[PDB]
Amino acid sequence: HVDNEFLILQVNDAVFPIGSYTHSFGLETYIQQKKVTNKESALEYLKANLSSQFLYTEMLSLKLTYESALQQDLKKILGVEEVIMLSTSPMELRLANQKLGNRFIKTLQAMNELDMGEFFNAYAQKTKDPTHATSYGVFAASLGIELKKALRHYLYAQTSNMVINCVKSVPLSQNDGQKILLSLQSPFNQLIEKTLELDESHLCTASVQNDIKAMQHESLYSRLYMS
Amino acid sequence: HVDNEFLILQVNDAVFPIGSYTHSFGLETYIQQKKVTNKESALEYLKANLSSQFLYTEMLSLKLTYESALQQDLKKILGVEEVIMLSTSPMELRLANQKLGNRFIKTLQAMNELDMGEFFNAYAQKTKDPTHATSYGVFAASLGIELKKALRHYLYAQTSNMVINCVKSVPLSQNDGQKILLSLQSPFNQLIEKTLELDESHLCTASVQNDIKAMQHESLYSRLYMS
Amino acid sequence: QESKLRLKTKIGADGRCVIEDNFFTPPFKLMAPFYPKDDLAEIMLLAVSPGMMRGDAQDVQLNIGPNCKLRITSQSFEKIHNTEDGFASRDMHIVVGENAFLDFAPFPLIPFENAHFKGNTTISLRSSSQLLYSEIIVAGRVARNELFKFNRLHTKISILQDEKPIYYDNTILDPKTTDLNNMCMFDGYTHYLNLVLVNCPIELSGVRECIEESEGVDGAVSETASSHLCVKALAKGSEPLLHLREKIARLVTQT
Amino acid sequence: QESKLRLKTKIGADGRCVIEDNFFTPPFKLMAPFYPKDDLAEIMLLAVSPGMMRGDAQDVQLNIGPNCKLRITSQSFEKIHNTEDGFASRDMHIVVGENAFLDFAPFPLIPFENAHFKGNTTISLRSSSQLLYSEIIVAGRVARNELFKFNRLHTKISILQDEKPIYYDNTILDPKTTDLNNMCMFDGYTHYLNLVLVNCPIELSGVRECIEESEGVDGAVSETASSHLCVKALAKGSEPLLHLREKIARLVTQT
Amino acid sequence: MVKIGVCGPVGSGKTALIEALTRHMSKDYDMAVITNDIYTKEDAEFMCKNSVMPRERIIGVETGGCPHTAIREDASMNLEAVEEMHGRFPNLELLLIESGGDNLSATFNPELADFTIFVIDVAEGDKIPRKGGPGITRSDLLVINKIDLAPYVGADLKVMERDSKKMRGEKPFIFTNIRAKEGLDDVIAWIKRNAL
Amino acid sequence: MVKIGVCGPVGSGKTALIEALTRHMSKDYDMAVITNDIYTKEDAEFMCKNSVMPRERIIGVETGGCPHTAIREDASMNLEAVEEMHGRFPNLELLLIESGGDNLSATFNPELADFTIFVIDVAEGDKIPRKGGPGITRSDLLVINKIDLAPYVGADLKVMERDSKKMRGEKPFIFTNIRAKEGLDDVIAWIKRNAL
Ligand SMILES: Nc1nc2c(ncn2[C@@H]2O[C@H](COP(=O)(O)OP(=O)(O)O)[C@@H](O)[C@H]2O)c(=O)[nH]1
Ligand SMILES: Nc1nc2c(ncn2[C@@H]2O[C@H](COP(=O)(O)OP(=O)(O)O)[C@@H](O)[C@H]2O)c(=O)[nH]1
């Protein structure tokens, strides 16, 4: 009795219990170093981060495991996940996306009345290093949720959490949070179109200062976030 | 440059700053009186509450102001809002939905780059007692968002907050929260179908024990919630 | 089978609230005033019939003249039988004048299996008027364990003060569309009181106290958008609710 | 225009790391070992040419025999000219044997306007091997204020330990698809160091210290999924990066 | 019109400070309190009596058990009460907003508070100010309270002053005994000067 | 295997209690600590030394500045550390989980904690236990600490015992001085009996 139109809202719900709010993915470093001090610099950070780390690692990896799941190719899915783990150097950024992946799967599995199907269950048994984005990709294909739609909700949900981190920690007025989310709608559509275009040769395309700030996050004198 | 596909996710985001988390709409009373002690009784509470207070007051009122907004009938919209105010007896429940309505409008208006159109702006100037559901109805019609879709997102968002209240206050395991949200999908669809069927003669159909528990919430010895 | 009750009151030549004009047809039986307090008159309303049947309809008209302080107590139970493909109805229009006080409730409703009942109550007040109004609804004949076997029940209230609406109630009970036993509706209780106090000389905390003293009542009081009081209560029998209502009526009529 | 460099080393008859076999064609100029420390041999790699042009391709092959402790330092800058409708490429395969240590980096890259450059680096290690490898990329000719005018740059790294992948890098820089100056990529700096330490006798806190002592470097170190170290750093010139790299290399070769 | 938030751990003297502040200042200033630190109905009362304020000048606002969110990322109901307090008092020059009790990571949304006072006390530890949360570093004024408990708990006030000055830079902090009105004049002076 | 959460306000003695508890009990019991009360790297250290525990037996988990959510509605990272602690210690019989400091509304998700100990102290007030939050009423054991500060702050311990017994019903509470190991044996006795 499962309705995909509701299920997609449920797994992308900000309160869906994977613990996203404990992670800044390096943003906390940019803040303590006074590179994100206000609405305009926050929007700059977000555009740059989404166009680099998020597009080539998170979004593209989701598309890849979706497509492989459709052909029930478990081997290619685990290969994508190995690439991501061996390519993501900053430890707190690597561990963040892995822990979120663990939580995502454990939560789906905790719901006994949701039948994910033989392939997803097989995936869930074998996966060594799932991330939130790869496991979500397999989830959406398994349930016949349309790729473009799956991407749209996932992108919005992850971005909202980054914007809220900015609101909490800069801090910014909660209204600025909403202006930023509105400004990002053209970029969101460009990102989705780009994701559909990109082949797997672009997977895990390197960022530079983003990685460095994610590593510097380990040594902060005082901090609130796990990454 | 506004995309309604994103905007609808944005205004229904759990972190969209209207303050829903500070309100239990009477649930806190049910909990301290040991009527909701676990997953099964919580699901009972939710089914009963959604089929009474939420269906006939919240959801139906949203459909009504949507339809009136399409014809640009401001008078009928303010009439629906007057009926709700004069019909909702428990004070904390009445004030909760009003405060949430204020916050919802003030937040849309704070975003200067969103053009709501001449009619919504006229609405926002005249409205005396908007609630979250009525103002949302006018919002969706003004932007050409399809009714059935508008209802789906609104229903999910408000219900997730009630389930989280159960998780925090009973308490329940966060997994139980998710099983509940999954169990509610058939009832969600019934509720939407029902909302489309119902005419305005059903508006503010009385509940009984729900109202009484909402009133008893005022005198609790110690409490965490505003309603 | 159209039953009527019409009543008009005035301050009489002796300074007491008196019946100026009346009329009724069965089932209604109206009795003559008695005087518990100085300014307080009490008139009993009774019913002589074995209930309402398919096609039955009642029309009540109350007019309470200026300066009248009146208590109308309905001493019977209104039973709705199986109405088949028809229904039974109750319409009431109530008018309260300047500086007048009215304490009134219709007979408690006991719907039988497949009973279909509709009612409409409109009340006009003046800014200086005072009102205590209430309604009780029962689940069925609890004696024989008939709970929520009726067809459908729909009752409405509108209260206007100088032509301006200050309160509404819309009660629709249909056991086919919902389980009326659920924890948001009757919640295992069989009897429901809904009560309004408009412009009365009583504080919310005083009403709250009466409710707390009442045994076998799960009930509460709260302030309406128009700054008046509303009381709702559930019970396993009519007596705890009727007694509670007496205590509240007493708190207002001693002031 | 296929340039080659092939190098194979072994522990020599005197107990020192020596060249067993080599070969090269221009631009490459290979020099003979010198011995700063007892076990530490150093071999300089130089380049005699004005840069790479459309169609140019390099192939490098390194084989570091068992027990060799070797430092290969590339003392030139690799300049990529306008390649028009073609591209220049650099392929490197590196093999490190048992109980062997290799310190190596290719020439820093300076892409000119409309340069198109591709490179691929594969490194095979044994569980007992030790490795320090790095790459530097610069924005353009900073002297003439040419920043990110190249066509496209794509370089890749794969490091395997006993046939099992332990590290990857995929670097794609295309000024047409993004502004490489943004705060997530070059962030106003013109020079980028990426460096890996595999199985080296050094603690993360030690590496973190060198980075802090380095002036004019925005940089950092972290532990990889395979438990090795990765360092990334940005600068306004090659010298602060090259110097930082020297300090790190020193920390491992004194142990 | 000028909003000043007061946060700090439970039992640190946030309420005592606000009561003693309005006792002194309400004479010369038009002012009110919004407070999230309430459980029982008898809480809001006790604050009115101790602060010598009319009940209409103090509004309690529940947090749903989320005292951090209530002053920070969704401040909605607190902001609703602010707009309410402006409806009651058109000439209002000063508004004190008290949190529901929190930890060193507590901050106010800029929409809610124009300035922030963080309140810790000596018996929590002398190593508290070097832990360095946003409550220590970001707040416009820090208040170290219950200094009279120092010799009994073994708290080194040179240590606390050293570490505080280090963390806040030139952002002022004030040592305090609220029961003895000690330093209370300093705090009052700060508000008049800084927030005006 | 048996998880016990420890919450309470900042400075109330949560850490002191956990350190003094492991000092005594780790001898006869296989046990570990997860803690959300950390800011600086030098926090997690100081707990290992004072508690006489190896570093692998204490995991710090950051809350993102949301210490209530971290033990309650989304406990995800704490739950992740629990499963980690079970990977390190297959024979583990007791796991102490310390919150990031909080207020009287603090509760643990049942998935996270099997039992809960709430810690307040005398200097916060003697009217604290009658405020009646879920920390006072719901917790399996309440600890009232720093009783030695009582005469100096004017705290009436008959009042505190009266009000506590009223609020908790038959749910046990224990008066305590942790520095003096006073009542510490009672707490230890409770854990052995109740949580086993
Ligand atoms: N010894 C001492 N006690 C104080 C001082 N200031 C406040 N207190 C007491 O500390 C306790 C907690 O104060 P309270 O206002 O309730 O703290 P809050 O929880 O932040 O609002 C109360 O019993 C106060 O009387 C002080 O300077 N010295
Ligand atoms: N007088 C007194 N002080 C105590 C007692 N227990 C702890 N303390 C002190 O109060 C402070 C409590 O610190 P801590 O246990 O870290 O509080 P936490 O924030 O709940 O973890 C420390 O400085 C202790 O020295 C006690 O029983 N009596």
Tab-separated table of N, CA, C and O in Angstrom, chain A residues 151-192:
chain	number	residue	atom	x	y	z
A	151	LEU	N	16.211	13.509	-8.340
A	151	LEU	CA	17.300	14.486	-8.226
A	151	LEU	C	16.852	15.827	-7.674
A	151	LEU	O	17.536	16.432	-6.848
A	152	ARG	N	15.715	16.306	-8.166
A	152	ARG	CA	15.160	17.582	-7.730
A	152	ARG	C	14.943	17.635	-6.215
A	152	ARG	O	15.350	18.602	-5.568
A	153	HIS	N	14.312	16.605	-5.646
A	153	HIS	CA	14.002	16.591	-4.209
A	153	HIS	C	15.272	16.450	-3.395
A	153	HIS	O	15.418	17.089	-2.354
A	154	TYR	N	16.171	15.587	-3.856
A	154	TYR	CA	17.416	15.316	-3.139
A	154	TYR	C	18.252	16.594	-3.056
A	154	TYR	O	18.745	16.950	-1.978
A	155	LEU	N	18.387	17.289	-4.190
A	155	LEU	CA	19.145	18.549	-4.266
A	155	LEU	C	18.586	19.623	-3.348
A	155	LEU	O	19.334	20.274	-2.605
A	156	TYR	N	17.272	19.817	-3.393
A	156	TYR	CA	16.647	20.779	-2.499
A	156	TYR	C	16.905	20.440	-1.016
A	156	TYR	O	17.252	21.321	-0.228
A	157	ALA	N	16.702	19.184	-0.635
A	157	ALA	CA	16.796	18.779	0.770
A	157	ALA	C	18.200	19.024	1.319
A	157	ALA	O	18.360	19.614	2.389
A	158	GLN	N	19.214	18.578	0.580
A	158	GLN	CA	20.594	18.767	1.010
A	158	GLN	C	20.974	20.249	1.076
A	158	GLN	O	21.681	20.673	1.999
A	159	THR	N	20.500	21.043	0.119
A	159	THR	CA	20.822	22.477	0.109
A	159	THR	C	20.174	23.239	1.270
A	159	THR	O	20.800	24.116	1.888
A	160	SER	N	18.924	22.910	1.565
A	160	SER	CA	18.236	23.524	2.685
A	160	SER	C	19.030	23.346	3.983
A	160	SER	O	19.165	24.277	4.777
A	161	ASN	N	19.561	22.154	4.204
A	161	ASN	CA	20.388	21.938	5.389
A	161	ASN	C	21.648	22.814	5.439
A	161	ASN	O	22.039	23.262	6.512
A	162	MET	N	22.271	23.071	4.291
A	162	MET	CA	23.456	23.949	4.233
A	162	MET	C	23.042	25.384	4.570
A	162	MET	O	23.690	26.060	5.380
A	163	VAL	N	21.958	25.847	3.943
A	163	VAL	CA	21.430	27.199	4.220
A	163	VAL	C	21.082	27.399	5.702
A	163	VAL	O	21.423	28.428	6.293
A	164	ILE	N	20.446	26.403	6.312
A	164	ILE	CA	20.166	26.462	7.740
A	164	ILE	C	21.430	26.510	8.596
A	164	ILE	O	21.481	27.239	9.586
A	165	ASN	N	22.451	25.746	8.223
A	165	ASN	CA	23.756	25.871	8.887
A	165	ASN	C	24.265	27.319	8.845
A	165	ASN	O	24.745	27.843	9.855
A	166	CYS	N	24.140	27.963	7.682
A	166	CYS	CA	24.503	29.381	7.558
A	166	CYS	C	23.679	30.257	8.501
A	166	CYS	O	24.221	31.130	9.169
A	167	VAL	N	22.366	30.023	8.546
A	167	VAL	CA	21.486	30.784	9.433
A	167	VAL	C	21.907	30.625	10.895
A	167	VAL	O	22.002	31.613	11.634
A	168	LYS	N	22.163	29.388	11.314
A	168	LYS	CA	22.527	29.131	12.708
A	168	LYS	C	23.886	29.723	13.097
A	168	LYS	O	24.030	30.301	14.176
A	169	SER	N	24.888	29.498	12.245
A	169	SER	CA	26.286	29.745	12.611
A	169	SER	C	26.964	31.054	12.195
A	169	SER	O	27.944	31.452	12.806
A	170	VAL	N	26.438	31.746	11.192
A	170	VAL	CA	27.064	33.004	10.776
A	170	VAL	C	26.966	34.120	11.840
A	170	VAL	O	27.985	34.710	12.188
A	171	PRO	N	25.756	34.410	12.369
A	171	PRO	CA	24.435	33.936	11.948
A	171	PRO	C	23.831	34.857	10.892
A	171	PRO	O	24.371	35.928	10.591
A	172	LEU	N	22.694	34.440	10.353
A	172	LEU	CA	21.946	35.253	9.414
A	172	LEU	C	20.527	35.297	9.930
A	172	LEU	O	20.120	34.437	10.714
A	173	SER	N	19.779	36.304	9.507
A	173	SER	CA	18.361	36.341	9.773
A	173	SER	C	17.710	35.168	9.023
A	173	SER	O	18.128	34.818	7.913
A	174	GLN	N	16.688	34.560	9.615
A	174	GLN	CA	15.996	33.452	8.958
A	174	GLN	C	15.376	33.866	7.618
A	174	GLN	O	15.215	33.029	6.720
A	175	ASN	N	15.073	35.153	7.468
A	175	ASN	CA	14.612	35.684	6.187
A	175	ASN	C	15.668	35.604	5.097
A	175	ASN	O	15.351	35.253	3.946
A	176	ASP	N	16.919	35.910	5.462
A	176	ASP	CA	18.035	35.795	4.521
A	176	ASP	C	18.147	34.361	4.029
A	176	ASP	O	18.397	34.113	2.850
A	177	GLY	N	17.945	33.414	4.938
A	177	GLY	CA	17.887	32.016	4.570
A	177	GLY	C	16.915	31.771	3.429
A	177	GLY	O	17.228	31.083	2.458
A	178	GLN	N	15.724	32.346	3.538
A	178	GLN	CA	14.703	32.151	2.515
A	178	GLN	C	15.014	32.870	1.183
A	178	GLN	O	14.718	32.335	0.104
A	179	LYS	N	15.611	34.061	1.253
A	179	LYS	CA	16.040	34.763	0.031
A	179	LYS	C	17.069	33.945	-0.732
A	179	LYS	O	17.015	33.818	-1.967
A	180	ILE	N	17.999	33.369	0.015
A	180	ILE	CA	19.026	32.535	-0.592
A	180	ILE	C	18.396	31.343	-1.311
A	180	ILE	O	18.707	31.076	-2.482
A	181	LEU	N	17.488	30.644	-0.626
A	181	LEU	CA	16.844	29.476	-1.230
A	181	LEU	C	16.069	29.843	-2.497
A	181	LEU	O	16.053	29.080	-3.458
A	182	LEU	N	15.442	31.018	-2.504
A	182	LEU	CA	14.786	31.523	-3.715
A	182	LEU	C	15.781	31.858	-4.862
A	182	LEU	O	15.561	31.483	-6.018
A	183	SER	N	16.876	32.548	-4.534
A	183	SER	CA	17.936	32.854	-5.510
A	183	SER	C	18.530	31.618	-6.180
A	183	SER	O	19.008	31.695	-7.308
A	184	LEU	N	18.501	30.478	-5.496
A	184	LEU	CA	19.192	29.290	-6.007
A	184	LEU	C	18.395	28.478	-7.036
A	184	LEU	O	18.899	27.478	-7.547
A	185	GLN	N	17.170	28.909	-7.357
A	185	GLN	CA	16.292	28.104	-8.221
A	185	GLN	C	16.743	28.007	-9.674
A	185	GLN	O	16.677	26.926	-10.266
A	186	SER	N	17.215	29.106	-10.256
A	186	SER	CA	17.872	28.983	-11.561
A	186	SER	C	19.097	28.066	-11.519
A	186	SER	O	19.190	27.150	-12.339
A	187	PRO	N	20.032	28.297	-10.568
A	187	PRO	CA	21.164	27.358	-10.460
A	187	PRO	C	20.754	25.892	-10.266
A	187	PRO	O	21.380	25.033	-10.893
A	188	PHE	N	19.732	25.620	-9.448
A	188	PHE	CA	19.221	24.254	-9.252
A	188	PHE	C	18.884	23.593	-10.593
A	188	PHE	O	19.256	22.452	-10.856
A	189	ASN	N	18.189	24.326	-11.452
A	189	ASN	CA	17.799	23.786	-12.745
A	189	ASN	C	18.984	23.552	-13.692
A	189	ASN	O	19.024	22.566	-14.434
A	190	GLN	N	19.941	24.471	-13.676
A	190	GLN	CA	21.184	24.263	-14.405
A	190	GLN	C	21.908	23.015	-13.917
A	190	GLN	O	22.377	22.217	-14.723
A	191	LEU	N	21.990	22.840	-12.600
A	191	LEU	CA	22.666	21.668	-12.023
A	191	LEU	C	22.030	20.340	-12.437
A	191	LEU	O	22.727	19.350	-12.722
A	192	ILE	N	20.700	20.314	-12.459
A	192	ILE	CA	19.976	19.100	-12.821
A	192	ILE	C	20.206	18.775	-14.293
A	192	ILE	O	20.532	17.642	-14.646
